[PDB]
Amino acid sequence: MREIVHIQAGQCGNQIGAKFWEVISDEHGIDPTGSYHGDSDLQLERINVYYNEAAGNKYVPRAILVDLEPGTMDSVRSGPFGQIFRPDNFVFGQSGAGNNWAKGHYTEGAELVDSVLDVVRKESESCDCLQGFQLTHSLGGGTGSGMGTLLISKIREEYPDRIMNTFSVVPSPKVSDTVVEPYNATLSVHQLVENTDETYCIDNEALYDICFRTLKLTTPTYGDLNHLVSATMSGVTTCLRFPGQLNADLRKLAVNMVPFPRLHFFMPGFAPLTSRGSQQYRALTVPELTQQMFDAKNMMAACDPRHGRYLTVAAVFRGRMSMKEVDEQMLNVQNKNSSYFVEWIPNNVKTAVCDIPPRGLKMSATFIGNSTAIQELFKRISEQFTAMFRRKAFLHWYTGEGMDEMEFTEAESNMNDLVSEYQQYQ
Amino acid sequence: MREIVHIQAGQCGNQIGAKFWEVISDEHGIDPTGSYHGDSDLQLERINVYYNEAAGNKYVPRAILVDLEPGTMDSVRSGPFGQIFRPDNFVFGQSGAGNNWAKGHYTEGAELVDSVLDVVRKESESCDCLQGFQLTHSLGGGTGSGMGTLLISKIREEYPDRIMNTFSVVPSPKVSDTVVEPYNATLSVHQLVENTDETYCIDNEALYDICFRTLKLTTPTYGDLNHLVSATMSGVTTCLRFPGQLNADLRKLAVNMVPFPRLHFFMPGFAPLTSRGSQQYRALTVPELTQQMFDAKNMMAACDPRHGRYLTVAAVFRGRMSMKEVDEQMLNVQNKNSSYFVEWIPNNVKTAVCDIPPRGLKMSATFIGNSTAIQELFKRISEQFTAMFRRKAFLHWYTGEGMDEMEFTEAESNMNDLVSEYQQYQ
Amino acid sequence: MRECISIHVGQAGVQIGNACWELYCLEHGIQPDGQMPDSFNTFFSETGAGKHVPRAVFVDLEPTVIDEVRTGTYRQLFHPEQLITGKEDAANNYARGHYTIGKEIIDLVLDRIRKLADQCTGLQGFLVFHSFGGGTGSGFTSLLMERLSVDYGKKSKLEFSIYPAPQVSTAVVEPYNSILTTHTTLEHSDCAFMVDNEAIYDICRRNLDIERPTYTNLNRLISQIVSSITASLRFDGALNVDLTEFQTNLVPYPRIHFPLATYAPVISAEKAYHEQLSVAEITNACFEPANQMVKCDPRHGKYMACCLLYRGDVVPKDVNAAIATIKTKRSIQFVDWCPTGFKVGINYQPPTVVPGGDLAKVQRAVCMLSNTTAIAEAWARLDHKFDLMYAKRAFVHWYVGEGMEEGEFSEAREDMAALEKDYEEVGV
Amino acid sequence: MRECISIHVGQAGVQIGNACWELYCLEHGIQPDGQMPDSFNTFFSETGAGKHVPRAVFVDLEPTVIDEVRTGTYRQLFHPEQLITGKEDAANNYARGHYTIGKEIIDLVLDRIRKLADQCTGLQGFLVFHSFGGGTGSGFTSLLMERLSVDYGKKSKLEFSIYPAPQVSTAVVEPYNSILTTHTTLEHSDCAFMVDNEAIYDICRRNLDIERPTYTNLNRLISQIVSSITASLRFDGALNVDLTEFQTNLVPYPRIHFPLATYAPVISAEKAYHEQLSVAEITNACFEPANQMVKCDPRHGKYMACCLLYRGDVVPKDVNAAIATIKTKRSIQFVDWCPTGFKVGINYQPPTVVPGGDLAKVQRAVCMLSNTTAIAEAWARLDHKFDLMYAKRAFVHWYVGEGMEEGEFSEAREDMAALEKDYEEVGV
Ligand SMILES: Nc1nc2c(ncn2[C@@H]2O[C@H](COP(=O)(O)OP(=O)(O)OP(=O)(O)O)[C@@H](O)[C@H]2O)c(=O)[nH]1
Ligand SMILES: Nc1nc2c(ncn2[C@@H]2O[C@H](COP(=O)(O)OP(=O)(O)OP(=O)(O)O)[C@@H](O)[C@H]2O)c(=O)[nH]1
Ligand SMILES: Nc1nc2c(ncn2[C@@H]2O[C@H](COP(=O)(O)OP(=O)(O)O)[C@@H](O)[C@H]2O)c(=O)[nH]1
Ligand SMILES: Nc1nc2c(ncn2[C@@H]2O[C@H](COP(=O)(O)OP(=O)(O)O)[C@@H](O)[C@H]2O)c(=O)[nH]1
Ligand SMILES: [Mg+2]
Ligand SMILES: [Mg+2]
């Protein structure tokens, strides 16, 4: 009854989308050919939320893959589970954005956005009642940032009453991948603060921290980080696909977590996460899950939650569990750390419980936190942008594409206003 | 693609021409009948630069022989390799110059130069793209000096865009083979400074010194001197005939060696040169070659290079070698003797390497030096000319042929200007 | 003869309805497919031959919870038309439940209520199950009660609601929804029975010796309370009270119509052996604050009226003696202007226990319904939370975007303050 | 899908291209006859059946060097019309290369590039290999760059050039040609990768333990560098970087586009056994002055932008750790206005080794493209030599006789001074 469409932009977006679709197919018992092979009918009752029935009992994911270079598209086509995607959904260009926001937003993005919007319009018209849109992309790149921004703007113009979710990776604090990262990040945030409903900020350094300290992984690989992100993504929308005691869809989480429209930047977390040698040394119960949530070590954003205050918190639990334990433990964790919770919002925590746990686990849970410590990341990105723009470095690359310095100034001012607001409500 | 046409004038010119053609034929594997008998195809790839294909796989040299008496031409025709020359190329008179510049330039030269010019014009039109001309002659003789200068003037009128080289033997300081040597030498250099691109000065006593001290030759003969000169001549143009790592043709050497149009008088040298006994007591390496180059004993001009400064230096290496050694040793020899190198020209040395070494030798190299010390030779010739002209000695021999004393004064002034410039740049 | 209609709204109302109808089917011997191998006529309709269908309506703006009913064990029990489902939930938003999403489906539900009413000859009233904190269970419930009051009028309507707990709450915007729903439904509900999840959690942990009570246990206990209330209609007793008697005996003033329910005895099989469960001891247990089903302290309040529903092997004389003993106790107090504050009801059929349940089989039981001024404390804490949240205008834009107005917020605040003032004035 | 076209000009360019195409044929398993027993299409075209022809153009104004190609082992690999030869060499004369002899052959070369580009669908840009000191490699290369910029425009052009060395140089008139060609191709270049001869001599002598390096070893090393640069296009990896990304990440200002190249690890088989070649230490080795490919001092300069290209068994976490360790080091420094100074690209294909080569087979390799202000020192020594030579008007008549004017010398001097001023101003 409720439908979710998927969009993947850029190399990072495509890779996370591939991992997420593999995880979802594993959950629903669908083999890489599109034929259902599960046992429990619960895997099939709400399968339409992510899959389309295309005759012959074959299910095709409701996804659109977008990129300005064929490389990642070819890699995802040739890789595992690359067959199930519809060949018409692969919309790819030839030039490539070259890690430039202006190229992906103004030059090549303008050319490709018409075809991408046509495909997304056909997909949305094919469904009965879409819940909303979700997009995976990066804010440091040229294809991801600019193209996903233009796409979000176009859909928000077309479908104003639907939910827009994004799972975007923000630039890392310590070591950067691209030289021009701050420009793209600042412009992308400038557009996101207006054109989206909720954003989940992911940091690669946080994922490395998790994989090293918590998962005891000797040699982490990008596949593992995408695995963690996909686990979070599956955890968020679990109540739309399986029955439970207390159900919460995307709109419920939105109405519970964002008090003011510009304050919709969340940090996600997942539990449990244990190494190979450490499974035997813990009894998997609700106390351990809720302890693993409220911990800076387990956060997927490179921001310390104890440097600020939580505005709202959402905890989505999966598995057969007792509601009394959940409620009393949320109350207890609120009581013990009252210094980290905003005083003028009683009951900062919103709860939801789903009966079906992920395959292989008896219990699992997903944490979404709207804290004011994201001001640190925004502040440092703004500071780097100011340092670069002071000397007009790399400015001709963006200016030659038709961009103006006024756009840079507007983006800087908007980020400063947002950090001012986040400091104000602290 | 690039063709060189050879000219021989006078007794000395004809003798060195015969020796040089013998050496070249041996290098290219051509028997004294004109038929190819070598093994390596490299001998035949660029054989057109000196030989014409005259049907029936027979090659004839592209050379013109000139003299005012049949004696030397009869001798060269009767001697070894005399058959390969084309009979029509033998242009000779009957009178003879009698060691008089006027006869060779005005009286008999005027009559015979038209036929010589027709022959060279035919030869040049036969080739597709000529590099230039080279002349072998003497400045102390009557036929050689006058005819060589007149021919040089005529060709420079006819072909102004082509390189003009001369291998001229100058009157020598200690002993003199002719009483009237300075007069002919004076007029010869007067014409040479204006009508040539580069001239290589050869001195008989320098060759005698090399043969005695270096080659340990008890009884040197004109054949050995001409052999050394031919070795130098073949070394100069080796890059036009064989492949190499760094290639330098005549035009490259000119543009690298002559900084001002009047300063194109070089002093060539060759290495290695060892006797029969002394061949066992050294290892043939680049250090020994470059040591043999920069030595007054090994130079073919009767002028000490240490009495002046080197303007430019060209070192053409033959054989399979390492370029690192060549560059490092040129730098080293530049550094050690900074007092003998001009300060306002960095990198006085130009290098070039050819893969094919001369037959019999593993490695060899040729040195061309443009040094101020040639001022000593010019000053000596000028002083002798002034000493004889003060008393008007032997002046009627030259006056009766139609010459005027004004020409003598102009030539004396030209030497004075030349030596003044050479001293100035010191 | 006399019939009763049940309406279940929202997730909580629907799940409570499943528990209640399972208990009814167990009591009357009706199989899950609707057959049985005649006082049940007040709760089940007879269709065709040997098929009994409940007189119930199930409403929710999202399909999953009622899809569970349509797929579960009791799929054959319910008429497929009287299970109404929407496509989008209200998402914890009163405005969506009231205006934006509520109005699309209310007409079909009203049609279904009317159709259930045609088959009724002696309809006594309506029972509504819902939660104060939810989006649909607040907004759509309020809209439904307004339309019902407009349409039917004098027929009584009784409420069974999930009042938000003092310190244990699930949602964040609960104070907004609670204040708005009381403001809207104050004048349209004849009587409301509130229970609290925290109190039932405590009761299950202490008296039933359960470590991890779930929602199913709470629903089972609530169904026991409801069955105790309606046993007078569904059977024949020595001294019975119907739906109208509750309203005419529990509300002293129209605006103060908020009694709370209390059930006894709630013991497991382990402790049922070591107690001779007489009438006096269970009557005493009904008055103890730790046993009450709303987290609140009756010690700081005053009783205006009490209703007792005796079930099973009970005789009137022991009841009268227990009432006298309660009256002499100085620890509890009745307000001065109510010399008589007790309503007694006695029934013969003992309480049936579901197989696999947590309660043990008992000979006698009591369901207490009393009006106490201590509810003003919970009202005050709710209003304090509302004031704290509304001082910053947090989450207002969500409600405004769906068609609401801040003037409605102010009106609800003023009305709840007036209700608190009325409670205080009654107290003295 | 996407294609890259190579141009090789002059003796140095032709020989470097020979080494490069040998390495490409080895990497893609193409025999010297063009047959193989599909990502190679970016460098090789497919004609008929079982034949691959490189997308390259070889130009020289003298025939001997290209005659060696036409007679050598790879005579069957190249298309006979894409090996263009003149008759007369430029003779280290910029005027001859640019006007007198260049204009007779330029149109044929342009026609060949047009024919080659007609067969490409996703052409990325042009790679040109040439030498600064030669007459052809300066004059004709500048003419080609100008005409290419006029005709194609936005397509990127990259140069691999042989910088004149500080103390070891072959020709005499080299400063004239270098200054003139830099002045001419400043405005028509997108980025130029710079190498020097004695630098590679030192690397071969020290790290490779070779006593007498020749031109072949230098060309092999340059080939390895170019293959490392284009591996992102010719294969697939964890994180790829195309031609445009280099230009957009390494060039902060249009006139500052002279990064220097650096390769690691360059070690023989003797020392390969005694070193565990991981990511960290090769990353450090790429930053030391003794290993860079231009004889220059970076310790007295400031880095502006850094690009690292990893190949083989490399994981991103080790790359991140190595970059962090480099950043925390004080002995090297980054300019203030560039807080983020690194660009990372990772490829899966390990480097291939030629048979009989000097480098050993290694699991991982790094290509470093660094933009630093230290190039100003080499600039300054070049201007010192040019001014010292031009004070006496030496060799000027050679250039004037071919149609050049002394005003061009003055303009080149002024432009080079302006470039030095720009570098100095950016440095502070
Ligand atoms: N006693 C009891 N209370 C419940 C149960 N299920 C939900 N609740 C209460 O309902 C409150 C939230 O409202 P819901 O019923 O879940 O939501 P809703 O009424 O369907 O309204 P929506 O937000 O539109 O879904 C929670 O705070 C719970 O206290 C239940 O099974 N038993
Ligand atoms: N690294 C390297 N440098 C070379 C090579 N060949 C020539 N060079 C450089 O080129 C410079 C001289 O220019 P050349 O390439 O020889 O001549 P050109 O570029 O063809 O121009 P012309 O003088 O007209 O022939 C020398 O100083 C060398 O440093 C080579 O194979 N490898
Ligand atoms: N988590 C994660 N991050 C990635 C992945 N691939 C790239 N990234 C990040 O994305 C950034 C590069 O942006 P990119 O998507 O390549 O630019 P684009 O091609 O223009 O969209 C880098 O900072 C990487 O850290 C991936 O597979 N997983
Ligand atoms: N090196 C060398 N010099 C010669 C040879 N024959 C003559 N000479 C020199 O030439 C001079 C004689 O001039 P000559 O050629 O006979 O006069 P011409 O007949 O007018 O050309 C003498 O000074 C000799 O030193 C020779 O075979 N080799
Ligand atoms: Mg609900
Ligand atoms: Mg050359």
Numbering used by the authors:
A (entry chain B), B (entry chain D): 1 to 426
C (entry chain A), D (entry chain C): 1 to 37, 47 to 437
Please, what does the article write about this entry?
The dynamics of kinetochore-attached microtubules are regulated by hepatoma-upregulated protein (HURP) and the mitotic kinesin-8 Kif18A, but the underlying mechanism remains elusive. Hepatoma-upregulated protein (HURP) is a spindle assembly factor that localizes to the chromatin-proximal region of K-fibers in a process mediated by Ran-GTP signaling. Through its stabilizing and bundling activities, HURP regulates K-fiber dynamics and spindle morphology, contributing to chromosomal movements and alignment. K-fibers also recruit Kif18A, a member of the kinesin-8 family that walks towards and accumulates at the plus-ends of K-microtubules.
Additionally, we observed a slight (0.9 Å) compaction of spacing between adjacent tubulin dimers along a protofilament with respect to a taxol-microtubule lattice in the absence of HURP, raising the possibility that this protein could indirectly alter the recruitment of KIF18A and other factors by modifying the structural properties of the lattice.
